[PDB]
Amino acid sequence: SELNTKIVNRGKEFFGSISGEKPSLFNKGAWMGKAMDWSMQNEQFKIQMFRFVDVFPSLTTSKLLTEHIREYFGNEQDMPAFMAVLNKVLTSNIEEMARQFIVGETTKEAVKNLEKLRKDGFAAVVDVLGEATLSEEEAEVYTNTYLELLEALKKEQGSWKGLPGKGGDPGLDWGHAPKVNIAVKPTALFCLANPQDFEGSVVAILDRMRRIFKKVMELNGFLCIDMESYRHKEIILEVFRRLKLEYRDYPHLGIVLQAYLKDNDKDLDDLLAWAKEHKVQISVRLVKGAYWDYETVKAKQNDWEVPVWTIKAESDAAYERQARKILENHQICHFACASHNIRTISAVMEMARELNVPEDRYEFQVLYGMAEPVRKGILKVAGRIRLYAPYGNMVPGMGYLVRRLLENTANESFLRQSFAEDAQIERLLEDPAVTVERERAARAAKGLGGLPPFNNEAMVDFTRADHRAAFPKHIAQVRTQLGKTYPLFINGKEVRTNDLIPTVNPNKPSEVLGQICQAGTTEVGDAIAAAKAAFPAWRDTDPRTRAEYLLKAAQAARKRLFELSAWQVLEIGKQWDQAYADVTEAIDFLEYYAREMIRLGQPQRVGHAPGELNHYFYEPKGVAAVIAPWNFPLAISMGMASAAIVTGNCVVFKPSGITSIIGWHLVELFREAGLPEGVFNFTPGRGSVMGDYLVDHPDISLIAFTGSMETGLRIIERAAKVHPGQANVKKIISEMGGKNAIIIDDDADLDEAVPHVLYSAFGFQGQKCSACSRVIVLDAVYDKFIERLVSMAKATKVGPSEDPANYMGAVADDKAMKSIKEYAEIGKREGHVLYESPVPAGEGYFVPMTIIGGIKPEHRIAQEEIFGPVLAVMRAKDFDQAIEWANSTQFALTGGIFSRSPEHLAKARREFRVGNLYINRNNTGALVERQPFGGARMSGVGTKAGGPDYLLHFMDPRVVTENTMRRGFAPIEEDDDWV
Amino acid sequence: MLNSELNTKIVNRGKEFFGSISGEKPSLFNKGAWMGKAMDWSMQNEQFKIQMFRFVDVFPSLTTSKLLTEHIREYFGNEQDMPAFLNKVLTSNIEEMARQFIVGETTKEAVKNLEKLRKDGFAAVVDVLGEATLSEEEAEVYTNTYLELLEALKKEQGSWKGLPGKGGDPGLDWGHAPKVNIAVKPTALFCLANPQDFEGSVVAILDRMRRIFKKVMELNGFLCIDMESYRHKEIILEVFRRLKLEYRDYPHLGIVLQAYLKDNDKDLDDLLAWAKEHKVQISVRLVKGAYWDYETVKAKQNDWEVPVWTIKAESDAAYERQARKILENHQICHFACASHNIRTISAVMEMARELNVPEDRYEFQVLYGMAEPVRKGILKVAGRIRLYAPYGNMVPGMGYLVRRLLENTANESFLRQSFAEDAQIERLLEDPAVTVERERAARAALGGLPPFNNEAMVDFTRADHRAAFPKHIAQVRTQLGKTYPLFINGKEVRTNDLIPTVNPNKPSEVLGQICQAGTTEVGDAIAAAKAAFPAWRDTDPRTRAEYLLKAAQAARKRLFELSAWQVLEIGKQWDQAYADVTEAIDFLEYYAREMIRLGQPQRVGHAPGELNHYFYEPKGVAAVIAPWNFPLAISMGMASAAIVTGNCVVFKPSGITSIIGWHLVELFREAGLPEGVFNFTPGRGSVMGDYLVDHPDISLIAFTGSMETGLRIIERAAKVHPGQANVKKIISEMGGKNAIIIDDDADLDEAVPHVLYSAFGFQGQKCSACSRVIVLDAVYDKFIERLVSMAKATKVGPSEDPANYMGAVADDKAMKSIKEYAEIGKREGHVLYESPVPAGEGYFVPMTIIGGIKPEHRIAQEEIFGPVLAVMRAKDFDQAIEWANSTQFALTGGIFSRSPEHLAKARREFRVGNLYINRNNTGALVERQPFGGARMSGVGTKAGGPDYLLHFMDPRVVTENTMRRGFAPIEEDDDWV
Numbered sequence A: 001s002e003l004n005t006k007i008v009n010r011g012k013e014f015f016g017s018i019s020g021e022k023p024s025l026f027n028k029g030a031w032m033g034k035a036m037d038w039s040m041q042n043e044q045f046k047i048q049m050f051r052f053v054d055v056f057p058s059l060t061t062s063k064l065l066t067e068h069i070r071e072y073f074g075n076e077q078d079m080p081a082f083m084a085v086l087n088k089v090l091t092s093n094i095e096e097m098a099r100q101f102i103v104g105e106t107t108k109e110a111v112k113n114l115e116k117l118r119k120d121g122f123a124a125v126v127d128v129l130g131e132a133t134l135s136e137e138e139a140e141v142y143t144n145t146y147l148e149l150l151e152a153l154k155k156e157q158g159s160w161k162g163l164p165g166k167g168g169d170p171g172l173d174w175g176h177a178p179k180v181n182i183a184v185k186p187t188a189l190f191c192l193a194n195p196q197d198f199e200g201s202v203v204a205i206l207d208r209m210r211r212i213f214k215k216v217m218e219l220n221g222f223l224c225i226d227m228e229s230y231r232h233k234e235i236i237l238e239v240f241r242r243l244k245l246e247y248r249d250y251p252h253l254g255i256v257l258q259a260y261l262k263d264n265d266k267d268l269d270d271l272l273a274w275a276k277e278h279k280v281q282i283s284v285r286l287v288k289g290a291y292w293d294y295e296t297v298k299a300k301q302n303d304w305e306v307p308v309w310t311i312k313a314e315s316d317a318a319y320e321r322q323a324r325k326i327l328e329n330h331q332i333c334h335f336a337c338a339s340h341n342i343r344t345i346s347a348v349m350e351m352a353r354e355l356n357v358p359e360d361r362y363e364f365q366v367l368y369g370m371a372e373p374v375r376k377g378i379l380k381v382a383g384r385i386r387l388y389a390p391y392g393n394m395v396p397g398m399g400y401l402v403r404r405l406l407e408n409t410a411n412e413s414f415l416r417q418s419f420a421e422d423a424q425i426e427r428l429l430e431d432p433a434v435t436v437e438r439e440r441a442a443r444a445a446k447g448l449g450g451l452p453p454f455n456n457e458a459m460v461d462f463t464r465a466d467h468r469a470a471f472p473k474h475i476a477q478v479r480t481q482l483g484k485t486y487p488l489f490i491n492g493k494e495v496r497t498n499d500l501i502p503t504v505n506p507n508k509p510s511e512v513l514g515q516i517c518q519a520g521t522t523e524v525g526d527a528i529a530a531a532k533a534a535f536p537a538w539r540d541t542d543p544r545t546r547a548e549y550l551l552k553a554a555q556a557a558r559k560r561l562f563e564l565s566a567w568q569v570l571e572i573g574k575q576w577d578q579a580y581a582d583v584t585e586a587i588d589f590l591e592y593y594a595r596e597m598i599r600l601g602q603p604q605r606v607g608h609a610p611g612e613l614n615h616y617f618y619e620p621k622g623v624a625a626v627i628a629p630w631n632f633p634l635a636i637s638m639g640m641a642s643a644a645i646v647t648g649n650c651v652v653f654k655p656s657g658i659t660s661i662i663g664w665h666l667v668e669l670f671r672e673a674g675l676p677e678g679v680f681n682f683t684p685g686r687g688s689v690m691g692d693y694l695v696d697h698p699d700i701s702l703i704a705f706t707g708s709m710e711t712g713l714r715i716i717e718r719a720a721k722v723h724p725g726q727a728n729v730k731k732i733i734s735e736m737g738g739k740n741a742i743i744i745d746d747d748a749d750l751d752e753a754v755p756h757v758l759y760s761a762f763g764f765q766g767q768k769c770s771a772c773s774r775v776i777v778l779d780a781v782y783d784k785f786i787e788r789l790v791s792m793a794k795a796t797k798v799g800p801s802e803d804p805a806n807y808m809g810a811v812a813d814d815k816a817m818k819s820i821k822e823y824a825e826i827g828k829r830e831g832h833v834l835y836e837s838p839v840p841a842g843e844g845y846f847v848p849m850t851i852i853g854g855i856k857p858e859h860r861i862a863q864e865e866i867f868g869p870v871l872a873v874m875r876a877k878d879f880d881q882a883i884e885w886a887n888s889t890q891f892a893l894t895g896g897i898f899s900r901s902p903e904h905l906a907k908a909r910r911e912f913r914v915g916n917l918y919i920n921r922n923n924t925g926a927l928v929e930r931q932p933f934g935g936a937r938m939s940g941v942g943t944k945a946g947g948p949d950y951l952l953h954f955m956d957p958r959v960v961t962e963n964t965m966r967r968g969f970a971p972i973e974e975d976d977d978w979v
Numbered sequence B: 001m002l003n004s005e006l007n008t009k010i011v012n013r014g015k016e017f018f019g020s021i022s023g024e025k026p027s028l029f030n031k032g033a034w035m036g037k038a039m040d041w042s043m044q045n046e047q048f049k050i051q052m053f054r055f056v057d058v059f060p061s062l063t064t065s066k067l068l069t070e071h072i073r074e075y076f077g078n079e080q081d082m083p084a085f086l087n088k089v090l091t092s093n094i095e096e097m098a099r100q101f102i103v104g105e106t107t108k109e110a111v112k113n114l115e116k117l118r119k120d121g122f123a124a125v126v127d128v129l130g131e132a133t134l135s136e137e138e139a140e141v142y143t144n145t146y147l148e149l150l151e152a153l154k155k156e157q158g159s160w161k162g163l164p165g166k167g168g169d170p171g172l173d174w175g176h177a178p179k180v181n182i183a184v185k186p187t188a189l190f191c192l193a194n195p196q197d198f199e200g201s202v203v204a205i206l207d208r209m210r211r212i213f214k215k216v217m218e219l220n221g222f223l224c225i226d227m228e229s230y231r232h233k234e235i236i237l238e239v240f241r242r243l244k245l246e247y248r249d250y251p252h253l254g255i256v257l258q259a260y261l262k263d264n265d266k267d268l269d270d271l272l273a274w275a276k277e278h279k280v281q282i283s284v285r286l287v288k289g290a291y292w293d294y295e296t297v298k299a300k301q302n303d304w305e306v307p308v309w310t311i312k313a314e315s316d317a318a319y320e321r322q323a324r325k326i327l328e329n330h331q332i333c334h335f336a337c338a339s340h341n342i343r344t345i346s347a348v349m350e351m352a353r354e355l356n357v358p359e360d361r362y363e364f365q366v367l368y369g370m371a372e373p374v375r376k377g378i379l380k381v382a383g384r385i386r387l388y389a390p391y392g393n394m395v396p397g398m399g400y401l402v403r404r405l406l407e408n409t410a411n412e413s414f415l416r417q418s419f420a421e422d423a424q425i426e427r428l429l430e431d432p433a434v435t436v437e438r439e440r441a442a443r444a445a446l447g448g449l450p451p452f453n454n455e456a457m458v459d460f461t462r463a464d465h466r467a468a469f470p471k472h473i474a475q476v477r478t479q480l481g482k483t484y485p486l487f488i489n490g491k492e493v494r495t496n497d498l499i500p501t502v503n504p505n506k507p508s509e510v511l512g513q514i515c516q517a518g519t520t521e522v523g524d525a526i527a528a529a530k531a532a533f534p535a536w537r538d539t540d541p542r543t544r545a546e547y548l549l550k551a552a553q554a555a556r557k558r559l560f561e562l563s564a565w566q567v568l569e570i571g572k573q574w575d576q577a578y579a580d581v582t583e584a585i586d587f588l589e590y591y592a593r594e595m596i597r598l599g600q601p602q603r604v605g606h607a608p609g610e611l612n613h614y615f616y617e618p619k620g621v622a623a624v625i626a627p628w629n630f631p632l633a634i635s636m637g638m639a640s641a642a643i644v645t646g647n648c649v650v651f652k653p654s655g656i657t658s659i660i661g662w663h664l665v666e667l668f669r670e671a672g673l674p675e676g677v678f679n680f681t682p683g684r685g686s687v688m689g690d691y692l693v694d695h696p697d698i699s700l701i702a703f704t705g706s707m708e709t710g711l712r713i714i715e716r717a718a719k720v721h722p723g724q725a726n727v728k729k730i731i732s733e734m735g736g737k738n739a740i741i742i743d744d745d746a747d748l749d750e751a752v753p754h755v756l757y758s759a760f761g762f763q764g765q766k767c768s769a770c771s772r773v774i775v776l777d778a779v780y781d782k783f784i785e786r787l788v789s790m791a792k793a794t795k796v797g798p799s800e801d802p803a804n805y806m807g808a809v810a811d812d813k814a815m816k817s818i819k820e821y822a823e824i825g826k827r828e829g830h831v832l833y834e835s836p837v838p839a840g841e842g843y844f845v846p847m848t849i850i851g852g853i854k855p856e857h858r859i860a861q862e863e864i865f866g867p868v869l870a871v872m873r874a875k876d877f878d879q880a881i882e883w884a885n886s887t888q889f890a891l892t893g894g895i896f897s898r899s900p901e902h903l904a905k906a907r908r909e910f911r912v913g914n915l916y917i918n919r920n921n922t923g924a925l926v927e928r929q930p931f932g933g934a935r936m937s938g939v940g941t942k943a944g945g946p947d948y949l950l951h952f953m954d955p956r957v958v959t960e961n962t963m964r965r966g967f968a969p970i971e972e973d974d975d976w977v
């Protein structure tokens, strides 16, 4: 109460001394102020304006600029009044808004302007614009930019008089702070920063951070480590902890902690405890956090718990609480209050006074070019105020710029409420804990048939220590299970044959995982007869009961998630994330197709004529042959088999030879679920022995196939014949290849495009039907794009997938390795090799990560599916040729485009006619419901797994029509057209 | 108001009526009897009413102890689940209830009881139970029963004193009425009574009615012609008018008019005017009407205007207004008031007084066994009461029995309100005209397009519809002799290869010559469709749909004309021709709405920072290979489906219906369809058949025809040739070998004409036609006797003559092949019926029924596609289902059964694409019965349903990452915070 009254009064004095002055961004007399004002009034404009700011620096020609302006804002008559002559004026206004937030474009300019800040009474923390670097070379340039900055400041600082204080050392700012203070972003220091390779990322970042830190120490300066997105939070904490311990006696090292994270109370507490345990001192810059929108979207997309508070006052309350904790611990922890919020600043000031904290233990910081009246008020009241002063160019600084625009204009922004909305001061200065209680209470004021709605199973989350630790443990566990013989499974019984084929670790072929029995035509004949005998009872089973078996199987897989994943790492060479996502997709199919059968399972009345009932409903076809691929050995198999099973068919299942153990997991899961015998039959076998036999058989009514075009087309041809005794015309559900292109338009965001294209091309060694095998790059952006793509590629390592440090590993088997390598030779003769990775020496089916330029549509590697880590780079003269080239193959599965032109995106949506088109992201990793997968042309037959049309393909519709009139009367039904 | 004053008298008379009989209830409402209890719970519980009434209907066919016991449990549950109120007991109660409404089971017993009624002071009008006869012999039995009855009464009437009256002849009832009075039901006199053959029906009925009336006049009696369902109303009026004019001086001939008909105000005026014109007198029995539930349902099933009033008080108001009109005309029109309604009766009594009507001009009539206190009431006040006294067996009387039961228990029933509902007397006796206004005023309390409704079937109750066909057949004959060219890329292309098309019922009548496309022309059409495809694909789905709606309006305007062409070109009967055209219109209307439904991309998934849209794309060029049997409908269905989904079409019509194929050209042209979107290429299959199917630019084949051709196309289409963009999509409807199962408890009066239509409708030239009838052992001999007796009544001949049931088959080849099958069939089983055919030209095959057929027989397996019906004898219900499922087809099926267990088994196990319960297995309508099957009958595509258009397209997904530099637009359906 009493402290809170002091805080409120301090805040009132603050607003009083501000004298009504508005920060420049809220100055309606300025163009910037007008543009932000309209963005705040009109959400559609805000979206257009911020997106235009983002794309602006890549509008490097007059044509690009004129066209983009028209497409984002409309013609001159239809755009707002505050908005060729037009190109020049708008360019000037955007340029000036960007310069608003930086102290310079270069090191020498920054240094000049920093001395100007000192004369106005301001300290600085200098930052070089950049984040999320794309290569080792770029990380080196960023690093050397700091070294150059430090050399320059080293020369200058001796001539700088220390900013005024009340005591201490006259050569230091305010008597105590080092005059040179810099901030560094960890993700700018290493382009593959990923907690999936936790130690690898820590070391690579720490190594460059150390070089910078040594130079900082050399001039008695301060180094602060910025905090970035939640994905890197633990990595960054570890870098700080390690670096601190190597130089335990050096006081001027800081770390950012974000009060908007639910983790932060524990993290702050742990860090303080850690500092005590090691008897070192630390420094914390407490912020709220800059990535709120991003964290909420990212967690939502992956069914992760949202790592940030979601009521704005909760972050404010957390800040006051955590700042009090830091101030109390001022002996061990130096404090930088980083906030533009007058309530927050006032709370810190009164808490510090109440605890009599020495002034050398806390200072205040704000962002350069923002909240100008607040900055001046702090200078007047506290005296110790530091500006975060970045420098550099618009492209690497674009994230920063957009974050500032977002920060100032958000509905919940303290600055917007104060300086745009004329919000009441009492409300603004209210204790946010009160606000929290009131908001939470206001906020305290679906599925079908008892089932929760569909949601995709949450992705593995390597920000968690337990998830990181799970893989090595489960891989070892799997290693105790090697060397078994896997029999056929037919009508609930194991059937052994004497033709065994070993399955091996593609990254270590001498490691034999097991031996697989092969079915001959006799055993396949037996599986078909078993399925046919089980069919009548299974068909007569209630759809909701059939769905329940899928639900139980899903729960069985969920309880074995990491175990099932580890099997794939070893048997087929999946990377950890790839393995896990394979299993979660299996679970999704089970959960989704169960719900879909429940939805489609109730007969629907059709028509509304009285005296008549028509019910429309579906019947299964009979026995389904399911011929599964090796590249998604649990997901796609389970997808195809469970769809066929849930719709009332019985299945004869042929796993791919090299992933037959994963195929055995379907036996384990369906057994665990209690599935009646004969409904699922497991029959691996040699295609050359029983492949045609399975497909030609008269008792097969349906064939679900996922694999190569040559095989799919053969199956389609053979299946069309009706043999004697054959009950139905065979239904084909087929997913075949792709030759997938991603287009890189002139205006593409290259920082997004590059890592997305690399992942699309080389994720899982390129062994996906959706993989990017052609990247088609617009003439004017080509050299910039390919230099960055190649440079990022050179940073990646090729090696065993059980080691998370490797980006990709060996391909499926010896035949694939030989085939892919020959294609790379073919490609190297057609075009010109741009990159060819090292591979480890010794055993393993390794193919280099390979990038080839100069490719044209008439070349073999622009047409034929390689199914491996071979990327063709094609140079298009204009957007029209890029589309024509994207459409130049016989396939139409997936595709992508990086572009920020509304016109080019619309042209792409219309003409780039693949089954799944991706805009501004990778073209792989389709999720159930979100991205139903499949295409036409030579890529398939227009069936889409994971979508609402899929189960229909496994059934035939029936209608029963009843005349309900007997002797002149009929019951009246609710949906009848009557009188 | 004068009207307020007269109403006061009516209400006061009603009140005294109610007071005198106060206490007394009709037998049916006596809750102390079994009759009363069953009715009581029926009135309380609508679910029980349906069970009981349906049970009464099935009861007489429960002829063994097993059938009886099982049905009892199936209709009413187990011994503990059913109400307190065995087989021998329940049999006796239901039998007692049926006897409540009859004066006897035999003529002798009837005559005895009628004499007993006279001595109680009641006149009678005697009826022989029965309606909707199934044969000429049954019609003769019925006619002779009246004759036998009349001969008996001729002998008895001499000894009868007239019922007491006020003056006149003591030998006449009340001094003036003839002692003998019978009523006859017209539809009991002719098994094929149908306004489609209006003249033939009138004459057939008139000839038997005359034979009866002559006997009636011979004893100076009265003949009343009952009125039946709306379908036969005009026929019945015309029979009455003709008979009346033949015996213009004989006064004892009456007709019933139904006040529940909207037509009745006009019908009554016309009849009164017709009588004045001809200077005859008439007699009208005015009733409300007995077929209300039926007329309402039937009208709605066919998109016809409901012929009855639908607010109950509107019928009461109609009755009082029409009664007044009759009484005003008492000098020319004798009046029988037939109602159990005290308000209605009281109104007629005061009106007869107000208008000073002589007593010999009106009498009162009620139904035997009903409304006993109202009956006694009338006898006491008016004295002139006549009971409608039917006699006969329960099976032909079942319609009458169920109508009585419905009558007494209905919600709006006056009897129910008065004697079970304890309703306020003031509300019961209020002027129905006031009730009408109250009820009407009480009822006052997808994107521009009307919802889908099927196009109204032709309605031969209308004189204009009856006149339309001869007019339009004649108009079509003035346009014969033309040469029809190909239609490619908007241009007519002639070739030198011509095939003539002729009238199958008269092959010397050539309708035209058709140009045949060679492979060069087919190639050109395919090239044209391919060239038009990009722009058509990019045309908005709503815009595409608009062409179909325009084409529908074009056809709707040409309905009778388009029908006429089919009558002459492929031997369609009038109804069959019209139905073919309305189905085409339905497809157009339905597929337009479907494309509009499917045409919008839909967001899928709910993750923020992401938009996934799911939508459809056309395939490219579609080959449409159409059949002759449904020449406009199925052609238009496949073609418009392909076109509305953004494909372009190369269309090959069947050779013998090439002119109907040209109609598609005309309709799409009138709609303004872009050139090349639809191309018309008749040609010889042996020249361009495989060429069309094999062509690398074809992406989809829609085929409807024989299994053999269908399976060939599926084989060839599976190959991917050089330059072929897609795996070809097959949409295919092939044949069936369809069975109807006649269960032990089947209603044979429904089943027989339904089976006959199913098998011989359009000469059996439907993929849905019944070619096997599977009859349960114990009912076999009875079913076949009735089936054959009805068949023998039908005539085979030219479809342009509506008197004929069926006519010539499609062409010479069809004729030859069907005849070979008939001979094979005759060797396998035993012929039960083989109709005559006209001598002279025409592709005539006899209506043929063959017995002793088993599943191993060729005609039990192979689709004949002609008028040849196999009858098979199943030993029990399980073998029946087994046999139904014994072919390689699964298109349609039927079952006539009233057993919940057996119907349940059939729904589950009789796995055809379209299963029909208790009706014919043909005539599938758009939306109501989406049509198609699997096995060898098809590939699981159902034309006319909500899954069909999907087959003509491929789905596409666009996914957009909407986040830039850490922010994204929040969308409405985003999962968020």
Ligand SMILES: Cc1cc2nc3c(=O)[nH]c(=O)nc-3n(C[C@H](O)[C@H](O)[C@H](O)COP(=O)(O)OP(=O)(O)OC[C@H]3O[C@@H](n4cnc5c(N)ncnc54)[C@H](O)[C@@H]3O)c2cc1C
Pocket: B225, B226, B227, B228, B256, B258, B260, B287, B288, B289, B290, B291, B292, B308, B309, B310, B311, B312, B313, B314, B315, B316, B338, B339, B340, B341, B344, B365, B366, B367, B387, B388, B407, B412, B413, B414, B415
């Ligand atoms: C001697 C005799 C002979 C008859 N002959 C024939 C005949 O040849 N053909 C024939 O069709 N009928 C005939 N009827 C009439 C029929 O059999 C019923 O007896 C009669 O319709 C019942 O009318 P009501 O005045 O007795 O009873 P009410 O309860 O007054 O009237 C019931 C009648 O109202 C009508 N009705 C019920 N619901 C509605 C509604 N929602 N909207 C509009 N109207 C409704 C029906 O016609 C129904 O029968 C005859 C009746 C008698 C007494």
Ligand SMILES: O=C(O)[C@@H]1CCCO1
Pocket: A226, A227, A290, A388, A400, A403
């Ligand atoms: O990059 C950002 O947006 C914040 C502000 C300063 C550093 O971290």
Ligand SMILES: O=C(O)[C@@H]1CCCO1
Pocket: B226, B227, B290, B388, B400, B403, B404
């Ligand atoms: O058959 C019937 O239901 C009516 C009643 C009397 C005759 O016609």
